[model samples]
Target chain A: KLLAGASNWVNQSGSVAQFVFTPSPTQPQTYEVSGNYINNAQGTGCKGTCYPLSGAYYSGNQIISFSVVWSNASANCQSATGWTGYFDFSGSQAVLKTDWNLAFYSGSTPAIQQGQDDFMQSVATVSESLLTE
Target chain B: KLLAGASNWVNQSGSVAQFVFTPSPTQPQTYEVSGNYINNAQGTGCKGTCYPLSGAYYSGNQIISFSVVWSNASANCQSATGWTGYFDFSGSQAVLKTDWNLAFYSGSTPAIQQGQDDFMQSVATVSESLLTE
Candidate 1:
């Protein structure tokens, strides 16, 4: 699996989303995906707290596509996005380029609306390796 | 089956590669990919002739990855590139963003030299299309 283990990702907006991509034991070419929500609360649901995101993914030839729900509808919002993305190695570094369809439902109103977005994030193997940790 | 049917693609170099992607009848998510070569000749095998390119591809979530050989080793050069690509709609128009690792052999010389290349091709449906057809 190309996207095995853990990673700390930064979205296009510079918001951080930490991920632990675990390959499924029973299913081939599929993974159990888990991650933390972005630090920004302006779009989440609450005003200050971050949420948890989880879902599954299918990958091949170092390519990946995953769907995750950051916040469930039980809360004030249910933030979800389906990522059809790959690694972009055109620059000085290898970056995770994720594009997706975002379906976000707010407490009442509603992206908290719906739209298409490309989430290009830099990939890093997380550890006690940086000041951000 | 996000990438069903056919498309005419223009790579990052502005070179053209026309493709007819037909889903495999026996295999589920795989497709038989066939296409014409680019119009360039400086790098092919000879100085002016364009070769034919053909291969197989697998796709999901509108994302695609395929491998094709534009010119075979039968001649002076055989150019091959594997495309790990997807559709980028984050623009006024939708584009086929393709990235690949190229392995080319020229008259037993060599990537005709090798490297990592992201072949971002613009997507178009052929027919009376436009220029250079």
Candidate 2:
């Protein structure tokens, strides 16, 4: 199946993020995200404290855009404002192509972490292909 | 099955890493890893050219230690020498507890990417539990 509506996501860091789009029973044009990603990349800190804040998803010709937010406001070590990036899909696999910036709090201050931006990047699987627009 | 002899691995970054332990037939205490991880985390760069170099595994009381290496010596973008970290296991589930340092070449120079070290840090499943050494 190809990426269409709702899908579950997992990163190299072993973090889980869920995406559910709008306009069901058809090709999806947008998505809503929920899950944890504070320590998705860096394994320095942030635990049960981190939580998803907000998210947005968009799709275009052969590309997918994702924007997401995470918070550990309790000084949990890291807190992310959000991340925006693009990727392409082939059957069930999606490969990110953009090196998006992830702005967040490193300790008590705000910082930016450079994200990966290489060909066939951010490899992930879509739940299943279905017209759940 | 639990993480026994050999099992396939996939990180959140969509990077695949493989692990094969020694002395298969009973509970395994050592493992050998193969797969790509050069751009497993940041996803800033590093493409198909990245290759696995070396790896080691150790176990203790209730923790598992993994040390791995990667090379894009050609400077495909990122080149990791290795990573060392510990995680606890509860049956088929494994949770990392220490924040390990992944030293690598960010571009043309060497750098470090702080690994996650939170409670219930990394959650992964084993292929299946078998009597493999």
Candidate 3:
């Protein structure tokens, strides 16, 4: 299998969550899904530290963004401002992605002490059928 | 599994000699790894051609590189000079990475060749574990 399907993987790591195409009665005959996350932490969390963030899916030709906010119950861990992510075709039938604009912010503030780390990963299976093409 | 473990991903053209971590118990308990390959043929392979160059991994920081060379037994396959690669962490139970300084070389030489495309991809497994604070 190119990728597995399961629960949430952006916020809390678990089983891989994915979307499979059942040959939708559409034009391209392809279905797509995206996963994104944002870390809401202090300076430590956003700039370089590790922090739990938010996650989501994006489907568009333009730049899409997301956030990864830690559970408010999190005591020490902060959050992240956010990051912008998107994917492209590299002509190899494989996917090529680029992620920039990771907004890192941290201060002595009460709620936004640190910024979280933004993460975006692909959900496409790229299974044998797709890769062989 | 989508990510299978084997040997000689680079320096060869097949298989994966990915670096794996069993989970450390240190404060910065983490082991990071990197992989890279370069093109080395002519103005063609040195630039936009899919030259079969070289491949390798870097266990050091400040930058370490590797090559992905094509076999002489290859016909249309070009060659890659090389690329620098390295891995880092942000305290999460996972891994972080970055790759740049890819120089594009191309010139009108019978073979003196200007440069080639540098591809540096990573091969590491993040085993299960609790967050590292």
Candidate 4:
């Protein structure tokens, strides 16, 4: 499985995110991601708010499991600290799927589980600098 | 002039960075960037440390001016609080170039000005998620 540079994964309805995956130096099968996620459509979760998201993921053969949390310094949606799921590439297309419980959750944020398969493929590679100066 | 989701930029002599740009809701011509930078070479700055890089940039006609800082909780390279430059996309390849003065600089970090143009084009758009569950 390939770690995503930026993927078209969905969290809330009509929301867009720009996530980047970085390999952990110490862990062979672990990665940490950071980026922004915003809801353009009115539904649940932080709408129109550019929230900072950071989390960790574990990659396996056609299976990727991850746990992430979005920041809400304004306490807007009371973002939950946990949104754990898996990105299964063993299917027709890649799917980032996660689950949750009503209790035993962490953080002041609320939880809205995802069940959409908006992912297709990575667009391009990033962070390649232009040492041109 | 496109804001990079993750640009493979060079900070130190032999280093790689994964940077992402997030637009500011309040400001139109301003954008904020965040990501990780680690040195694979050893000339200057935090060597082999996966330091956090963050800053802001203002986009103008063919010019992108940004001021960024890398965090070094360990105070390696004395991690400077400033790395200001301009990204020139008016030429063949896009270059994030900026300048800094030693006199009026802030933070406990050392200054190493960039004079290289290693940029070409963006690789991808990230943070896009898969709502598949």
Candidate 5:
């Protein structure tokens, strides 16, 4: 309930992430998060890469959702038009615990999916989605 | 001479930046720097924007250089293929001094340029380029 404002959170890779949480006044336990994750263009090599989190929403600590659009020119990853995912956070550590499906898309066509089994704490180890970035 | 390894730098807007400096073995007074700057898709508006430094090179305390490639699909800015810029550091504060030109290109066509007169300390107040990002 006291999760409003900015704080530093660590991803599973032990990388530090900056998070800003804003709660909705009308909706109880609902919030929006601004997150930044590593994002290098795949293969070509980069010194540092970081993509900002867009349109992230969370409700009642049980459902968190977000999406990103990956352009073909950037070709920064596996080459998909976009991605959308949902997950839940649990325990005092705020671990990302369950119901996560990070799916890549090619203009409405599903290209790949990173699911529940792929997540460990705040990191996604199964696929190269936003969690992996 | 002590400016090596990781240190916190600030852009003109009072925002914090992470910088890593590594010296070259064969070249005296030459260094490679890794820098992270804000990057949001131009018109879409974003919460956080960070584009990383790729191939940033500095010779002595005089010349600092780096660039970025902007893709059409992302259309994150004024729409260009890439951008390149150079500047120097001077004074006790390590202020980014003169001889700087940040230019945006659509392949080979010059689209925009931010020059020496635009910088103050580490901030670029005149043009967008990467400095405004």
Candidate 6:
């Protein structure tokens, strides 16, 4: 049976986010955030991950934590978190480490029931005087 | 002395976010969101806006509203909201409109202040039918 037909292929977005932090000489260097992706629906079921920028340098060290924000159609749709990864310029790489995992369903993320996609991203940092100051 | 001595100009982000909605044949096509953009400290204040896509097409009709969340550094750094915007393919252009106004001050955004930058984005919808089905 040699039939020529097209396979059901869905092309949506996979969760991929990255965060980087560079401390100022006078501040703790914070990052304020607000914004929505495609997981604002009631039954959409969403999940998130957070860690420091250094977490992205290696493999296992990136295991941060997850915070779930139950869907809220109105007046509520965003969340925030922080971490303390690695990024020592005095060492090798001049960067910050961050870990994130934002899970959500889109138009065609099949493997995840109801159109879900496990969002993945890396966080990095770049500090100069983390050893002294 | 009207001379410019390599003016140390700051280029920071200013708050600006927009969202819209479109109903599906069976589901209320929702929008999920998460992430940070600087301004996650206690003294730092942030605001949000939510409205329908239809609000943008015409000027007077785009007056939505805003919701604020007190900052929480540990388990909170993001927020989300939903709105019923417009995207009537049955009509012309078949476009969706969104309105946003995120405020954060940074070294450069003289108006935004104290290393803050207002994050701004837009949300459009393109659903087929109403979710009331």
Best by lDDT: 4
**TM-score of B chain for each model?**
0.59, 0.49, 0.30, 0.57, 0.49, 0.21
State residue A34's C-alpha deviation in candidate 3, in Å. 8.2
lDDT value, candidate 6, whole model = 0.25
Per-chain TM-score, chain A, candidate 1: 0.58
lDDT of 2 by residue, A39-82 (tens): 33444343222244355556545443454433222223323334
Measured with C-alpha atoms, the lDDT of residue A113 in candidate 4 is 47
In what order do the candidates fall by TM-score, top score first?
Answer: 4, 1, 5, 2, 3, 6
* Per-residue lDDT of candidate 3, residues B29-129 (tens digit): 33333321222223222211122223333333423344444322111233223444444333432232323232222333223223222222333222111
In candidate 1, which residue pairs get closer than 3 Å at backbone N, Cα or C atoms, i.e. clash? B104-B112
The DockQ-based CAPRI class assigned to model 6 is incorrect
DockQ of every candidate: 0.02, 0.02, 0.02, 0.04, 0.04, 0.04
Q: Candidate 4 on B1-133: residue-level lDDT in tens?
A: 6645446554324444556678889988777767665444433333333456667767665343333233232223322334565666566555555454212123343234444323334333222121210
Cα RMSD to native, each candidate?
Answer: 14.1, 16.3, 15.8, 15.7, 18.7, 20.0
How does residue B73 of candidate 6 score in lDDT?
22
lDDT of 1 by residue, A24-107 (tens): 554345455556656442454433334444334434333443433333323433333444444444566556544344433233
* Model 2 DockQ vs. reference: 0.02
Each prediction's TM-score versus the true structure = 0.37, 0.33, 0.23, 0.38, 0.36, 0.21
* Residue A12 displacement in candidate 5 (angstroms): 22
Instruction: Give a tens-digit lDDT track for model 6, residues B1-133.
Output: 1111111111123232333322234423222222222222233232121111222122233222333332322112233223223332333222333333433323333231112222222222222111111
> How do all the candidates rank in terms of lDDT, highest first?
4, 1, 2, 5, 3, 6
Evaluation by TM-score, superior candidate among 4 and 5: 4
Please list the C-alpha lDDT of all candidates, in the order they appear: 0.44, 0.41, 0.28, 0.46, 0.39, 0.25
Worst 10 residues of 4 chain B by lDDT: B124-133
For model 4, the interface Cα RMSD in angstroms equals 14.7
Per-residue C-alpha lDDT of model 5 across residues B1-133, encoded as one tens digit per residue: 4545444444443333445567878778767666554443222221133545544555544555544333211113332212233344446555443333333444455545543322333322221111111
Give me the overall lDDT of model 4.
0.46
